[PDB]
Amino acid sequence: SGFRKMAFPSGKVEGCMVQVTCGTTTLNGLWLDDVVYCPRHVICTSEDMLNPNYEDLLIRKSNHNFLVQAGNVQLRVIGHSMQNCVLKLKVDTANPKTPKYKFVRIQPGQTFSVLACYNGSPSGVYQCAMRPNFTIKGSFLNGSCGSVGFNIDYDCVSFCYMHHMELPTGVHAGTDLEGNFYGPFVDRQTAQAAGTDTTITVNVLAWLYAAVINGDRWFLNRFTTTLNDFNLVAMKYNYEPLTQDHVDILGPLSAQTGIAVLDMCASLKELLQNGMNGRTILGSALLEDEFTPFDVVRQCSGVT
């Protein structure tokens, strides 16, 4: 028992991290097979960041200008290309530590582990969610760019995120591994609206099921609700509307606990309307939304 914000073991990803330097800028790169992936803003200077012309900046760069170092060994760059907001540096050596991997674009509300890196070296690993508004509330300092997000299914790493920037609001924005930003964000040092964020309702419900499985049951009540009634409450409290697809995904947790999804919705409704009254759930004094139903079952069943 117990419930933690658990990240995937980062080993397979640590072995892929490299340092990429271009001019005076150093950031992290991802070495898979004979390609190093990194944010394209590695080619910018501070004058550029305000409105960079990436095509023009990249034209002044040659393969020898991209310094790629894996630990202490230098990689030889034999090609460079820009795909959306990422640079793909073709190197002459395939990473011997390349795990089985996929590049996937996650959906808002889904979770992933982030391996924060500086100068190509891993510093820590944490679990987070892609917010409904396509930002992540990460922990990243200067030099963290190129750190990646991923999920692991047995031996396969599915990379879903590459870190590009911190917005003026202190939240984080980045791309999938094809360099497409999640959300409306551009790789430019400008004010950028993230838009209204909402709480990931299906994840709060999955977390309430985790709480029941782990013994925290105080919030269970004698009530039920309907999807329409619950969604009226969800709207008022900036929660994502619950759909039958969300109910269906919560199926296994409803079966495990014997608590019908709409009954758990009624518990959530009462918690939204009345708060926690100074009580806690799984060590938290707020409603947690960064655990998907998949995460709850995984952590509650011990998938390795």
Ligand X SMILES: COc1ccccc1OCCNC(=O)c1cc(=O)[nH]c2cccc(F)c12
Interface positions with ligand X (CB under 6 A): 1, 41, 49, 140-145, 164-166, 172, 187-189
- For a second copy, the closer CB: 148 or 262: 148
Identity of residue 102 = K
The distance between the two most distant Cα atoms of the chain, rounded to a whole number of Å, is: 69
One of 41, 80, 163, 172 is an active-site residue; which one? 41
HEC secondary structure over 92-152: CCCCCCCCEEEECCCCCCCEEEEEEEECCEEEEEEEEECCCCCCECCCCCCCCCCCEEEEE
Task: Check residue 4 for interaction with a second copy (CB under 8 A).
Answer: yes
Q: Which of 83, 192, 214, 256 binds a second copy (CB under 8 A)?
A: 214
Choosing among a second copy, ligand X, none, which partner's interface includes residue 300 (Cβ < 5 to 8 Å by kind)? a second copy
- For a second copy, the closer CB: 258 or 278: 278
Q: What is the layout of strands, in order, in the sheet containing 17-22?
A: 73-75, 66-70, 17-22, 25-32, 35-39, 86-91, 77-83
Which neighbouring-strand residues pair with 74? 69
Contact 257, 246 (CB under 8 A): no
Choosing among ligand X, a second copy, none, which partner's interface includes residue 189 (Cβ < 5 to 8 Å by kind)? ligand X
Active-site residue 156, yes or no? no
Choosing among a second copy, ligand X, none, which partner's interface includes residue 188 (Cβ < 5 to 8 Å by kind)? ligand X
Task: Check residue 76 for interaction with a second copy (CB under 8 A).
Answer: no
Active-site residue 80, yes or no? no
Contact 151, 160 (CB under 8 A): yes
Contact 264, 256 (CB under 8 A): no
Contact 36, 73 (CB under 8 A): no
Least distance between ligand X and beta carbon 137 (Å)? 11
Task: Check residue 72 for interaction with a second copy (CB under 8 A).
Answer: no
Task: Check residue 217 for interaction with a second copy (CB under 8 A).
Answer: no
- For ligand X, the closer CB: 164 or 246: 164
Q: Which of 118, 181, 185, 230 binds a second copy (CB under 8 A)?
A: 118
Choosing among ligand X, a second copy, none, which partner's interface includes residue 49 (Cβ < 5 to 8 Å by kind)? ligand X
Positions 8 through 37 that interact with a second copy (CB under 8 A): 8-11, 14-15
What is the rounded distance in angstroms from the CA atom of residue 33 to the CA atom of residue 147? Answer: 18
What is the rounded distance in angstroms from the CA atom of residue 124 to the CA atom of residue 58? Answer: 31
Contact 113, 10 (CB under 8 A): yes
Closest to 82 (Cα-Cα) out of 52, 49, 58, 66? 58
Which one of 32-40, 45-53, 55-63, 271-279 is the stretch in contact with a second copy (CB under 8 A)?
Answer: 271-279
CA 45 to chain centre: 27
Choosing among a second copy, ligand X, none, which partner's interface includes residue 67 (Cβ < 5 to 8 Å by kind)? none
Choosing among ligand X, a second copy, none, which partner's interface includes residue 164 (Cβ < 5 to 8 Å by kind)? ligand X
Closest to 68 (Cα-Cα) out of 118, 120, 103, 105? 120
One of 16, 85, 128, 145 is an active-site residue; which one? 145
Task: Give me the active site residues, please.
Answer: 41, 145
Contacts with a second copy, residue ranges (CB under 8 A): 1-11, 14-15, 115-119, 121-126, 128, 137-144, 166, 170-172, 214-215, 275-276, 278, 280, 283-286, 298-304
